[PDB]
Design a protein around this ligand. Sequence first.
Ligand SMILES: *[C@@H]1O[C@H](CO)[C@@H](O[C@@H]2O[C@H](CO)[C@@H](O)[C@H](O)[C@H]2NC(C)=O)[C@H](O)[C@H]1NC(C)=O
Ligand SMILES: [Cu+2]
Ligand code: NA
Length: 227
Amino acid sequence: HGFVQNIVIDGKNYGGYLVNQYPYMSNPPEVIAWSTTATDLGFVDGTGYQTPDIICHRGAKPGALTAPVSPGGTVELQWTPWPDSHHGPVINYLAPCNGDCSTVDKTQLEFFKIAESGLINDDNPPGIWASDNLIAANNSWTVTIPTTIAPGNYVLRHEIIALHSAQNQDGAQNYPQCINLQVTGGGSDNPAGTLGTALYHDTDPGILINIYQKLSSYIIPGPPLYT
Ligand SMILES: *[C@@H]1O[C@H](CO)[C@@H](O[C@@H]2O[C@H](CO)[C@@H](O)[C@H](O)[C@H]2NC(C)=O)[C@H](O)[C@H]1NC(C)=O
Ligand SMILES: [Cu+2]
Ligand code: NA
């Protein structure tokens, strides 16, 4: 349980959507982060993989702002303190907005995977995962925007999937957090995208999994990594 509370883009701070506070106030600030209704600080499980909740979290609506990012610039997502028990991959996707990200219809967004990190070491199950790397790095993750993609407005969908209860169907816990970016650079690729409701199936081998054993491999879920 947790959420992204701050985003640092090329060293500049952007406040996150404070789901622990803004849902309860009359005039919350405009931010680059999507609003959500995930006020339990919780997740979307497999029962929601084919519902709009999986796209940018439950009840999500586009942030009102969009942040410029330099070519191949860095986006650091700073989470609230992430529990060590919530072992699993950290995955990052972009979807072109083809216009103002604040007005997008999220069910139309076609995401391509830009980064993925999974099981790092399993000599002592449940092992060391991307989520443990995130914890060690001040509860944060840094995404580099590809230099090869066409510039314009994009939604970054940043996600931890916690696998501590994933041994049973719909047990995996997805924690997606979305922000709006204005991407720059000399790239021209428009990578093949996947609707948010088509990213995951509750039978995927990295989703329905018992991590309390020595795994020789881990198939990070979702569509293929774009390079
Ligand atoms: C480690 O993470 C913390 C908390 O997530 C970061 O704290 C934020 O720092 C920015 C920049 O100073 C502030 O504007 C925010 O208000 C802080 N938020 C909280 C909750 O403290 C901290 O900067 C990170 N340390 C780094 C990146 O070295
Ligand atoms: Cu939790
Ligand atoms: Na690739």
